[PDB]
Amino acid sequence: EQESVKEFLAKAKEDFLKKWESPAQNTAHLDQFERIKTLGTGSFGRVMLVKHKETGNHYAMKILDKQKVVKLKQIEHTLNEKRILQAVNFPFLVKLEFSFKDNSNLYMVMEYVPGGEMFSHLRRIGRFSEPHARFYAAQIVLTFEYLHSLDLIYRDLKPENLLIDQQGYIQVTDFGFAKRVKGRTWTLCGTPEYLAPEIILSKGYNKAVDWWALGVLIYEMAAGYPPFFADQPIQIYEKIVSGKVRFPSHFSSDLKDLLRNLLQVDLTKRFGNLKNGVNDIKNHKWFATTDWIAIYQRKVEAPFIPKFKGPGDTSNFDDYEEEEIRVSINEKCGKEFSEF
Numbered sequence: 001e002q003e004s005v006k007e008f009l010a011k012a013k014e015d016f017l018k019k020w021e022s023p024a025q026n027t028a029h030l031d032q033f034e035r036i037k038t039l040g041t042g043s044f045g046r047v048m049l050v051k052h053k054e055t056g057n058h059y060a061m062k063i064l065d066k067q068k069v070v071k072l073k074q075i076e077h078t079l080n081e082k083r084i085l086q087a088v089n090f091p092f093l094v095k096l097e098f099s100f101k102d103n104s105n106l107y108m109v110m111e112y113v114p115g116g117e118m119f120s121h122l123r124r125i126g127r128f129s130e131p132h133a134r135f136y137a138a139q140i141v142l143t144f145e146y147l148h149s150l151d152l153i154y155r156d157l158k159p160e161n162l163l164i165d166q167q168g169y170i171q172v173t174d175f176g177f178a179k180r181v182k183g184r185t186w187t188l189c190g191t192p193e194y195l196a197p198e199i200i201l202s203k204g205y206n207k208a209v210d211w212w213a214l215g216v217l218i219y220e221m222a223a224g225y226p227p228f229f230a231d232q233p234i235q236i237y238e239k240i241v242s243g244k245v246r247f248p249s250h251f252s253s254d255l256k257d258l259l260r261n262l263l264q265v266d267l268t269k270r271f272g273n274l275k276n277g278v279n280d281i282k283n284h285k286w287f288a289t290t291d292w293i294a295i296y297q298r299k300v301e302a303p304f305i306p307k308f309k310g311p312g313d314t315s316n317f318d319d320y321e322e323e324e325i326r327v328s329i330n331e332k333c334g335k336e337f338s339e340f
């Protein structure tokens, strides 16, 4: 009868409890970790596959230099990433298990997702079939619906920020540019191929940019390249603001229509931003075969599952220059990160 859904609830609840109960409390841990590999780098730090010595559990630890963040005046964005990650809760959002900080660095310890970024699989495959891209796009749509319901804008949608877990589902990562926006915001951020026209025009924008990004994402996933690709960034921006997009011949009619409605330069005509909102996308003919409830419950069988070999295997990840992380004997920028 209905007793099996109780067993499913109990199993998911035990997984959640274990994942809560083994991590250290916030700002209580020290470098008590074996550092295995760098999974990505940025202006102020890196993300490392990491093994907690006392537990043997593996995580992805984002390490950030406090001095570098302060010198480039990016305190608010890093605090935003930590606060948003610790405040949200959704199946397709990466989980922040715990966090700490020392004399030099900020540490955001997240769940480890061994399947790698979607960008790697897309580059090695060439492009996804339209059902594959639809499987990914439905999760992105639900995630944006949740986030926008929370008045949050993601602002960093790109194939590199979408990890694939062992079940083939998406884990959205990198929230350094996510921001709780009531009304408008003006910050220039995001990769050039995914920038919305209102961002390029420096006009002030809202959550609609996310939906624009989705269009781009879908296009890329279905074509193997972004819609406004060019060699120089200036031509990329010219093509983005031009209001013109050419689709490959293999694109179906429904996909072309959806993309034409998502890539609307006019904010007042872009899907996701209209009166019906996200429903305008969820009721589109391209998504007619999509069981939104089943996708949310992760009951749909994925079209692609990465080949794994246990936690600690990083074959699905690119290789980066490994560095030694040193912590000063003196505390840097303490009052600046008192809320972290």
Ligand SMILES: CCCOc1ccc(OC)c(F)c1C(=O)c1ccc(C(=O)N[C@@H]2CNC[C@H]2NC(=O)c2ccc3[nH]ncc3c2)cc1
Binding pocket: 039, 040, 041, 042, 043, 044, 045, 046, 047, 059, 060, 064, 074, 077, 078, 081, 094, 110, 111, 112, 113, 114, 117, 160, 161, 162, 163, 173, 174, 175, 176, 177
């Ligand atoms: C132009 C660059 C400017 O860089 C900043 C700009 C602004 C800023 O302010 C907030 C910054 F801090 C920075 C940074 O320094 C920064 C340091 C490292 C990374 C990074 O590694 N990115 C990965 C590469 N592609 C996806 C990312 N993957 C995960 O995040 C992740 C998470 C959990 C996971 N679990 N399993 C796998 C797994 C993966 C990104 C930025």
